[PDB]
């Protein structure tokens, strides 16, 4: 045999989220472990996660009973600010990171003191502290299981959040346009990624070379009548809208009404009297 009863008896399972493949506890330990001489000072973490259609950026502290979310911004909230398409690209990650940073600073009380960069030019800068004021709100990046390659969208979300006013310690070693050999960051290329350029040249090349593939990949943009040139102004306007009004608007859907609707779809657990009734009925029919 292969999987014997002794095997199942002595089998010890990994933690639930390790079984689900959602948490790297080796990295989580170092990310959340606070120095004990600092006591109850929380260690805020910028969790950046990517789905097939959206970007989820959260600011999370860790406690004994569980994690607590300080601020959040989902790329589905970008249509409010004008970004309707490409809600999962490098620039969408930047917009979500910017929105998270503004929301956290507003909730903390540092938005009017740490505005970050209003017009991101692609330069690598850290949010400097005030000489006679409070230190910037410190948050550390959490990439999860995403591999940390150069130009990764996890670093895009960090760059947006850092530009939003949050102090995220980092180096330009992973921003797009950074050359490993010369250790220099290409500010123009980073600005191109910040304003959605790389997609724009992609439409330009597809238009030039393969019109059919242009239609298939960018069906939403083509059907909505937006060209490659409009991307920079759209994202710049979106950043301005985010900065001027970063508040989160709660949905008006009735949770109780949909709970009642979903209770009908949710099948019930059957009773123990039913257990015995099916059992001896099966015994009778089997003889």
């Amino acid at each position: 045999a292969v999987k014997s009863s002794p095997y199942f008896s002595r089998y010890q399972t990994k933690y639930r989220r390790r079984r689900e493949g959602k948490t790297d506890y080796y990295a989580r330990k170092r990310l959340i472990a606070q120095a004990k001489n600092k006591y109850n000072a929380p260690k805020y973490r910028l969790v950046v996660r990517f789905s097939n259609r959206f970007v989820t950026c959260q600011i999370v502290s860790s406690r004994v009973n569980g994690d607590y979310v300080l601020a959040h911004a989902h790329s589905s909230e970008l249509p409010r600010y004008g970004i309707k398409w490409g809600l999962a690209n490098w620039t969408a990650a930047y917009a979500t990171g910017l929105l998270v940073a503004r929301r956290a600073l507003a909730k903390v009380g540092l938005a009017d003191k740490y505005e970050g960069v209003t017009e991101p030019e692609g330069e690598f800068e850290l949010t400097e502290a005030i000489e006679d004021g409070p230190r910037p709100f410190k948050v550390f990046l959490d990439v999860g299981l995403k591999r940390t390659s150069t130009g990764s969208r996890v670093f895009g979300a960090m760059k947006g959040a850092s530009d939003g006013g949050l102090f995220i310690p980092h180096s330009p070693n992973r921003f797009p346009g950074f050359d490993i050999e010369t250790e220099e960051l290409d500010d123009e290329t980073l600005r191109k990624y910040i304003y959605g350029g790389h997609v724009a040249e992609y439409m330009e090349m597809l238009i030039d070379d393969d019109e059919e593939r242009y239609q298939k990949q960018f069906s939403g943009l083509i059907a909505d009548g937006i060209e490659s040139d409009q991307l920079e102004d759209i994202y710049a306007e979106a950043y301005a809208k985010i900065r001027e009004d970063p508040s989160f608007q709660k949905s008006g859907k009735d949770a109780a009404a949909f709970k009642a609707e979903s209770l009908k779809h949710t099948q019930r657990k059957l009773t123990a009297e039913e257990r015995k009734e099916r059992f001896n009925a099966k015994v009778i029919e089997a003889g």
Partner: protein, 157 residues
Amino acid sequence: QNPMKELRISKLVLNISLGESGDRLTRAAKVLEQLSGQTPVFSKARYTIRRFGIRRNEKIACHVTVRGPKAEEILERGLKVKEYELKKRNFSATGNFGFGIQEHIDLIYGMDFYVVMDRPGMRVARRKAQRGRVGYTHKINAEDTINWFKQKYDAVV
């Protein structure tokens, strides 16, 4: 049948095992290069065998993996060589198959084809994040591979 259940050639691996290193291994290597248009991989010896005079980590075999239309067309020429005839033993219980060809001129060195089959959804097993096991109803059997062989190429097993 659900269209998501269609069998598609995941990869097709060309392997040439000479048992000796040197110029023969290198000239066998660029034959893979000209055949597949890809840089081959030199496999190092797993164990030391004094009977064969083999030391560990010495380069002995060269293999390559081809995917997509090039893998399909190389499969086309291989099946044409074999006259679309393969034995029942040739199909793995997992749903894979392979065959060796004595001479490469017709596409001297003998070498092995191996076709790896899958269905769209096997990324769940081959990814890193949220890695899981492909369901039994989604797994491929030897019989399913033999059928998909027969209706695709009108082949006789």
